[PDB]
Amino acid sequence: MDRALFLAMSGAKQNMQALQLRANNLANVSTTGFRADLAQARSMQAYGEGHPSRVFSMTERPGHNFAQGSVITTGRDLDVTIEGSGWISVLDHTGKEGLTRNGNLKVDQNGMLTNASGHLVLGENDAPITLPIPLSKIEIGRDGTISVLPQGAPAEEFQAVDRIKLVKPNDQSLFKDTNGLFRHKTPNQPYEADATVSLQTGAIEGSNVNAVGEMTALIDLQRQFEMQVKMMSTAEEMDKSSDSLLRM
Amino acid sequence: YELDYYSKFGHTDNYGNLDLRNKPYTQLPSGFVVKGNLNISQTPIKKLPKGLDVGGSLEATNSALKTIRSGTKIKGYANLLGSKIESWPRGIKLGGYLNLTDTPLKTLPAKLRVKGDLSVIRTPISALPEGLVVDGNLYIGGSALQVFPDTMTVKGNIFLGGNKITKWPSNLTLGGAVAP
């Protein structure tokens, strides 16, 4: 039949995919250090012989919202949030390094510093931070310097042991990977530490998802979705009527 | 009246193409820069500003454009179909083809280089400039041209379109064919 049936179907299909991207945003409102995902549609025309009447649209992710997340003051010593722009460099389960903004850190039984996702926290030597096992008081600095008190030591024996690797690259050069870690679009790009990134210890950075912004985008995808499915029915209606040209 | 900075913003797309179709603008500010393509079709604009820069292609089909001043930079093509241009200035940096079909064009710059196709279809031009170089297809159909210069260069096909050519260039190397 007419190709407008599939031209509208290819549009309704993308609206559902855009709806899925907004659904993931609203599910992650309470998530810690979550960067909102933007949804956009690209107009692609079928170039060739004939009148230029058919143009497809596909939904794609143009970028992410890198605005500062909501800061939650918790009073916990091992809670860190990046003041302004900046990232925390961590290595995932496989070992590939990446940037994260979740500062819900913790100390394991061996002293290794991890975050809430389990990623190991990189240090001054581009290696995971391993603090002494018998600690007494962890006091993270504003610049990322970790000053710990050995167990049984006097309060005046406060010494720095490591400095968290904070990286502030261009946000437009970062893409979210398959596990929520932002990495460089260009492969084999070294993550260079920055001396301007600051860590506000004792607070946790929340999500930056604008709940109303997603809701008002939802009510427009639904209407656009319903208009296209009416086009599918009216293209079906036209073909059924034209079925009476071979009756003879 | 004339286009302002705020009026410019209301005729620009996401990638930076200025659309002035049917808009009542008479003159553009000097030193004008366009991020992408420029469209001044059907406009009462009779003159393009000096120092004009277009990051894309200039579209002036069926417009009132008459004068383009030298120094204009156009990255894409120039489409002046149906406009009121009578002469082409010297020193225009054109990154694409030049379509001058159905224009009152009479004179062309000497040793003009067209990086794309050239059209003089149905134009009152009497003779082509010496040393003309065309990297694409040349359409002279329906024009008043009947004598080619001593030397010319066309890297594509040459379409006569109906006009009769009597004096062919002495030095001519053609990458394509000649069609009547």
Partner: peptide, 24 residues
Amino acid sequence: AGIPGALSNQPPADASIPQDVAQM
């Protein structure tokens, strides 16, 4: 001819004049 602002279905090339449209 007819309409003055018809489109062209050929992909942009910026070097070849589109002959799909009635370029007169």
